[PDB]
Design an enzyme around this catalytic site. Structure first.
Site, PDB file in Angstrom:
ATOM      1  N   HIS A  83      18.685  51.845  -9.671  1.00 38.11           N
ATOM      2  CA  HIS A  83      19.383  52.949  -8.970  1.00 38.11           C
ATOM      3  C   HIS A  83      20.870  52.668  -8.798  1.00 38.11           C
ATOM      4  O   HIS A  83      21.308  51.520  -8.919  1.00 38.11           O
ATOM      5  CB  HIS A  83      18.721  53.257  -7.614  1.00 38.11           C
ATOM      6  CG  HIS A  83      18.839  52.147  -6.624  1.00 38.11           C
ATOM      7  ND1 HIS A  83      18.001  51.052  -6.634  1.00 38.11           N
ATOM      8  CD2 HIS A  83      19.691  51.963  -5.588  1.00 38.11           C
ATOM      9  CE1 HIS A  83      18.309  50.258  -5.620  1.00 38.11           C
ATOM     10  NE2 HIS A  83      19.342  50.781  -4.983  1.00 38.11           N
ATOM     11  N   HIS A  85      23.220  52.158  -6.574  1.00 36.10           N
ATOM     12  CA  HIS A  85      23.926  51.588  -5.412  1.00 36.10           C
ATOM     13  C   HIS A  85      24.818  50.442  -5.844  1.00 36.10           C
ATOM     14  O   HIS A  85      24.597  49.850  -6.907  1.00 36.10           O
ATOM     15  CB  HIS A  85      22.968  51.104  -4.296  1.00 36.10           C
ATOM     16  CG  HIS A  85      22.450  52.201  -3.418  1.00 36.10           C
ATOM     17  ND1 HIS A  85      21.283  52.080  -2.694  1.00 36.10           N
ATOM     18  CD2 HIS A  85      22.927  53.443  -3.159  1.00 36.10           C
ATOM     19  CE1 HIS A  85      21.066  53.197  -2.019  1.00 36.10           C
ATOM     20  NE2 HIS A  85      22.058  54.036  -2.276  1.00 36.10           N
ATOM     21  N   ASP A  87      25.090  47.378  -5.105  1.00 35.49           N
ATOM     22  CA  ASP A  87      24.489  46.054  -5.304  1.00 35.49           C
ATOM     23  C   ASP A  87      23.652  45.923  -6.588  1.00 35.49           C
ATOM     24  O   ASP A  87      23.143  44.829  -6.854  1.00 35.49           O
ATOM     25  CB  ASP A  87      23.652  45.644  -4.086  1.00 35.49           C
ATOM     26  CG  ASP A  87      22.545  46.627  -3.757  1.00 35.49           C
ATOM     27  OD1 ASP A  87      22.634  47.860  -4.087  1.00 35.49           O
ATOM     28  OD2 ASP A  87      21.548  46.153  -3.174  1.00 35.49           O
ATOM     29  N   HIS A  88      23.521  47.013  -7.360  1.00 33.82           N
ATOM     30  CA  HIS A  88      22.820  47.007  -8.666  1.00 33.82           C
ATOM     31  C   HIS A  88      23.653  47.560  -9.808  1.00 33.82           C
ATOM     32  O   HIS A  88      23.519  47.107 -10.953  1.00 33.82           O
ATOM     33  CB  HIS A  88      21.498  47.758  -8.562  1.00 33.82           C
ATOM     34  CG  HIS A  88      20.691  47.317  -7.393  1.00 33.82           C
ATOM     35  ND1 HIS A  88      20.136  46.052  -7.314  1.00 33.82           N
ATOM     36  CD2 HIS A  88      20.427  47.926  -6.216  1.00 33.82           C
ATOM     37  CE1 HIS A  88      19.575  45.907  -6.124  1.00 33.82           C
ATOM     38  NE2 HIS A  88      19.701  47.046  -5.462  1.00 33.82           N
ATOM     39  N   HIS A 159      14.148  55.877  -2.504  1.00 31.23           N
ATOM     40  CA  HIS A 159      15.245  54.984  -2.169  1.00 31.23           C
ATOM     41  C   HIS A 159      16.615  55.604  -2.491  1.00 31.23           C
ATOM     42  O   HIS A 159      17.549  55.518  -1.683  1.00 31.23           O
ATOM     43  CB  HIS A 159      15.083  53.604  -2.807  1.00 31.23           C
ATOM     44  CG  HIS A 159      16.166  52.655  -2.398  1.00 31.23           C
ATOM     45  ND1 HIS A 159      16.185  52.038  -1.164  1.00 31.23           N
ATOM     46  CD2 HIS A 159      17.290  52.259  -3.036  1.00 31.23           C
ATOM     47  CE1 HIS A 159      17.262  51.287  -1.068  1.00 31.23           C
ATOM     48  NE2 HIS A 159      17.954  51.408  -2.187  1.00 31.23           N
ATOM     49  N   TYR A 190      17.484  54.238   6.986  1.00 32.73           N
ATOM     50  CA  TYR A 190      17.335  55.691   6.675  1.00 32.73           C
ATOM     51  C   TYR A 190      16.706  56.482   7.801  1.00 32.73           C
ATOM     52  O   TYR A 190      15.739  56.027   8.412  1.00 32.73           O
ATOM     53  CB  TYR A 190      16.423  55.920   5.443  1.00 32.73           C
ATOM     54  CG  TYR A 190      16.981  55.469   4.088  1.00 32.73           C
ATOM     55  CD1 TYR A 190      18.117  54.638   3.998  1.00 32.73           C
ATOM     56  CD2 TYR A 190      16.320  55.810   2.907  1.00 32.73           C
ATOM     57  CE1 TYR A 190      18.592  54.196   2.761  1.00 32.73           C
ATOM     58  CE2 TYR A 190      16.793  55.372   1.661  1.00 32.73           C
ATOM     59  CZ  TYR A 190      17.932  54.586   1.594  1.00 32.73           C
ATOM     60  OH  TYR A 190      18.405  54.161   0.383  1.00 32.73           O
ATOM     61  N   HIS A 224      15.933  43.615  -6.041  1.00 37.32           N
ATOM     62  CA  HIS A 224      15.878  42.447  -5.169  1.00 37.32           C
ATOM     63  C   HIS A 224      14.609  41.637  -5.412  1.00 37.32           C
ATOM     64  O   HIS A 224      13.506  42.083  -5.097  1.00 37.32           O
ATOM     65  CB  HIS A 224      15.959  42.869  -3.701  1.00 37.32           C
ATOM     66  CG  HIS A 224      17.162  43.699  -3.376  1.00 37.32           C
ATOM     67  ND1 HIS A 224      18.368  43.147  -3.002  1.00 37.32           N
ATOM     68  CD2 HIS A 224      17.345  45.040  -3.369  1.00 37.32           C
ATOM     69  CE1 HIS A 224      19.241  44.112  -2.778  1.00 37.32           C
ATOM     70  NE2 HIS A 224      18.646  45.271  -2.994  1.00 37.32           N
TER      71      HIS A 224
HETATM   72  O1  LIG Z   1      20.058  48.696  -2.176  1.00 38.74           O
HETATM   73  C1  LIG Z   1      20.009  48.798  -0.912  1.00 38.74           C
HETATM   74  O2  LIG Z   1      19.955  49.890  -0.332  1.00 38.74           O
HETATM   75  C2  LIG Z   1      20.016  47.513  -0.172  1.00 38.74           C
HETATM   76  C3  LIG Z   1      21.198  46.662   0.120  1.00 38.74           C
HETATM   77  C4  LIG Z   1      22.639  46.835  -0.163  1.00 38.74           C
HETATM   78  C5  LIG Z   1      23.155  47.970  -0.777  1.00 38.74           C
HETATM   79  C6  LIG Z   1      24.517  48.040  -1.041  1.00 38.74           C
HETATM   80  C7  LIG Z   1      25.356  46.975  -0.699  1.00 38.74           C
HETATM   81  C8  LIG Z   1      24.848  45.844  -0.085  1.00 38.74           C
HETATM   82  C9  LIG Z   1      23.484  45.765   0.177  1.00 38.74           C
HETATM   83  O3  LIG Z   1      20.708  45.541   0.723  1.00 38.74           O
HETATM   84  C10 LIG Z   1      19.361  45.521   0.896  1.00 38.74           C
HETATM   85  C11 LIG Z   1      18.712  44.343   1.510  1.00 38.74           C
HETATM   86  C12 LIG Z   1      19.335  43.735   2.604  1.00 38.74           C
HETATM   87  C13 LIG Z   1      18.751  42.591   3.152  1.00 38.74           C
HETATM   88  C14 LIG Z   1      17.598  42.068   2.562  1.00 38.74           C
HETATM   89  C15 LIG Z   1      16.996  42.665   1.457  1.00 38.74           C
HETATM   90  C16 LIG Z   1      17.574  43.808   0.905  1.00 38.74           C
HETATM   91  C17 LIG Z   1      18.835  46.752   0.286  1.00 38.74           C
HETATM   92  C18 LIG Z   1      17.432  47.217   0.208  1.00 38.74           C
HETATM   93  O4  LIG Z   1      16.602  46.890   1.095  1.00 38.74           O
HETATM   94  O5  LIG Z   1      17.149  47.955  -0.754  1.00 38.74           O
HETATM   95 ZN   LIG Z   2      19.737  50.601  -2.876  1.00 43.52          ZN
HETATM   96 ZN   LIG Z   3      19.735  47.026  -3.345  1.00 43.60          ZN
END
Ligand SMILES: O=C(O)c1c(-c2ccccc2)oc(-c2ccccc2)c1C(=O)O
Ligand SMILES: [Zn+2]
Ligand SMILES: [Zn+2]
Length: 266
Positions: A83, A85, A87-88, A159, A190, A224
């Protein structure tokens, strides 16, 4: 007199930013990201595919790992995403500039990517990254083939609107291995019920649990890695405790049911 607050950059655990060498998953498939963010390189006789890139700052590391695998910038043909976001899909715009790669994604992921993650349904402008354009729009169940690895898109909205599981068949020891890269089924912070920006959020998640449960799934990987119980830093044992797609979906649904109940209480 108090000024407006400075912008705050989103910060993450050190392990999310910790480089690692390529880790082989199957004959053509490697983890090339960090210890705690997935970025999958699939290498074929007719070019390479990247599924996810992780955070914005990981671009150069991914390119170094590609070179270690014998994959040049010109050799990278395609980027797919779980997706869109930060972080990906962080480094996607920079990878497109520095390589031959084109992006295929569904309309929802393409729109969010083009936005650089801004105006997120849940995060608002809190987690923005450099925007990128998709080169090809894919429909649910659509297949993309590169060097005879056949990737199938399975939409699993929730998500994000455009969340996707990508499935393909690789080999190990001459035997088929059905790999499932299933997207996140978290709902971090959310609003789930009566959300005006996502009215059918709950129904989409429930259908997405069912989708994930039913995927062709000899090996499950997640954006993750902890969500599917992978430990990339554990070398030979990295994938030993990995969940099935069925177990991942069941755990996610149980957590979601708890979150719904807490929301109603709050
Ligand atoms: O993609 C997301 O929405 C998540 C993020 C995130 C998203 C953007 C920037 C930094 C972190 O962290 C997490 C996360 C934070 C702490 C532990 C495990 C996942 C996400 C998740 O649960 O999907
Ligand atoms: Zn995400
Ligand atoms: Zn993420």
């Amino acid at each position: 007199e108090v000024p407006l607050p400075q912008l705050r950059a989103y910060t993450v655990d050190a392990s999310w930013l910790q480089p690692m060498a390529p880790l082989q998953i199957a004959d053509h498939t490697w983890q090339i990201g960090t210890e705690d963010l997935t970025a999958l390189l699939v290498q074929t006789p007719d070019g390479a595919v990247l599924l996810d890139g992780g955070m914005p700052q990981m671009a150069s590391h991914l390119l170094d790992n590609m070179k270690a695998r014998g994959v040049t910038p010109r050799d990278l043909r395609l980027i797919l995403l779980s997706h869109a976001h930060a972080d990906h899909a962080g480094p996607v715009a920079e990878l497109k500039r520095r390589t031959g790669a084109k992006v295929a994604a569904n309309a929802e992921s393409a729109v969010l990517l083009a936005r650089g993650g801004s105006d997120d349904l849940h995060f608002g402008d809190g987690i923005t990254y450099p925007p990128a354009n998709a080169d090809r729009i894919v429909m649910d169940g659509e297949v993309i083939t590169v060097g005879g690895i056949v990737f199938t898109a399975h939409f699993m909205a929730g998500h994000t609107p455009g969340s996707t599981a990508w499935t393909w068949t690789d080999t190990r020891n001459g035997k088929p291995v059905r790999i499932a890269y299933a997207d996140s089924l978290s709902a971090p912070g959310y609003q789930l019920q009566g959300n005006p920006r996502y009215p059918h959020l709950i129904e989409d998640y429930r259908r997405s649990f069912a989708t994930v449960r039913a995927l062709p799934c000899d090996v499950l990987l997640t954006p993750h890695p902890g969500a599917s119980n992978w430990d990339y830093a554990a070398g030979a044992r990295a994938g030993a405790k990995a969940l099935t797609c069925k177990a991942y979906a069941d755990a996610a649904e149980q957590k979601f049911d708890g979150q719904l109940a807490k929301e109603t209480a709050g």
